[PDB]
Amino acid sequence: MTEYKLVVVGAGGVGKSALTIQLIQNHFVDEYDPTIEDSYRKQVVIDGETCLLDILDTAGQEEYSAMRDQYMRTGEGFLCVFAINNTKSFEDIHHYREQIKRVKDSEDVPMVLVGNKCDLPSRTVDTKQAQDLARSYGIPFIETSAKTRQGVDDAFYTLVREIRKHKEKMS
């Protein structure tokens, strides 16, 4: 009955699509056209509450989408995703958070920092690094693998729990 509008953002290749599809369909996609942006819905139970997750997997294509606009402005929570084997994608995080702050005109937007691909040994971004950045933003940090499903539910559900904290402060 309660809906949650989630948006997944981050540099190309970090695993935004694989994480979303893992969440909704419980499998790991080998390849997914990096230009495809679409929303995915799933009814789930989180801490005993039935809700519908309405999740926008962004792809960053300059072509107009009225759905995208709607989601960024009405998006209640955002997953900011980098890959632990992609130093540049971690450097790109701040750009994403800053543009979310602008859309919401707020420094307190429900948001979670996600370090994806944590099954890979070629790690270049250590946990303390990402934990210190999330400390600065005042948001949770979760390490995930869309391949093995580690942390995937935790990432999306933690975001819902952040939206709940926000919603109950604002009223």
Ligand X SMILES: Nc1nc2c(ncn2[C@@H]2O[C@H](COP(=O)(O)OP(=O)(O)O)[C@@H](O)[C@H]2O)c(=O)[nH]1
Cβ closer to ligand X: 30 or 47?
A: 30
Tell me the number of residues near ligand X by CB under 6 A.
Answer: 19
Alpha carbon dihedral 125, 131, 133, 134, in 10-degree steps, equals: 130
Gap between the Cα atoms of 107 and 147, Å rounded? 32
**What sections of 5-151 are H helices per DSSP?**
16-25, 66-74, 87-91, 93-104, 127-137
154 sits near ligand X (criterion: CB under 6 A): no
Give the residue with the Cβ less far from Mg ion, 46 or 93: 93
Residue 17 binds to Mg ion (criterion: CB under 5 A) = yes
Query: Footprint of Mg ion on residues 20-49 (CB under 5 A)?
Result: 34
Q: Which residue's CB is nearer to ligand X, number 139 or number 146?
A: 146
Cα 28 from Cα 109, distance rounded (Å): 29
Residue 87 buriedness (CB in 10 A; 0-12 / 13-18 / 19+): middle
Name which of residues 32 to 91 contact ligand X (CB under 6 A). Answer: 32, 34
| Nearest alpha carbon to residue 157 among 53, 72, 61 | 53
Does the annotation place 38 within a ligand binding site?
no
- Residue 117 lies near ligand X (rule: CB under 6 A): yes
Q: Toward Mg ion, which CB reaches closer, 16 or 117? A: 16
In the DSSP assignment, the letter for residue 35 is: T
The verdict on whether residue 154 carries a ligand-binding annotation is: no
Q: Is the dihedral of CA 95, 109, 129, 114 positive or negative?
A: negative
Cβ(167)–Cβ(109) under 8 Å?
A: no
Window of 9-17, 63-71, 92-100, 161-169 that interacts with ligand X by CB under 6 A: 9-17
97: contact with ligand X by CB under 6 A: no
* Residues touching Mg ion, count (CB under 5 A): 3
Per CB under 6 A, residues contacting ligand X are: 10, 12-18, 30-32, 34, 116-117, 119-120, 145-147
Q: Which residues are annotated as a binding site for GTP?
A: 10-18, 29-35, 59-60, 116-119
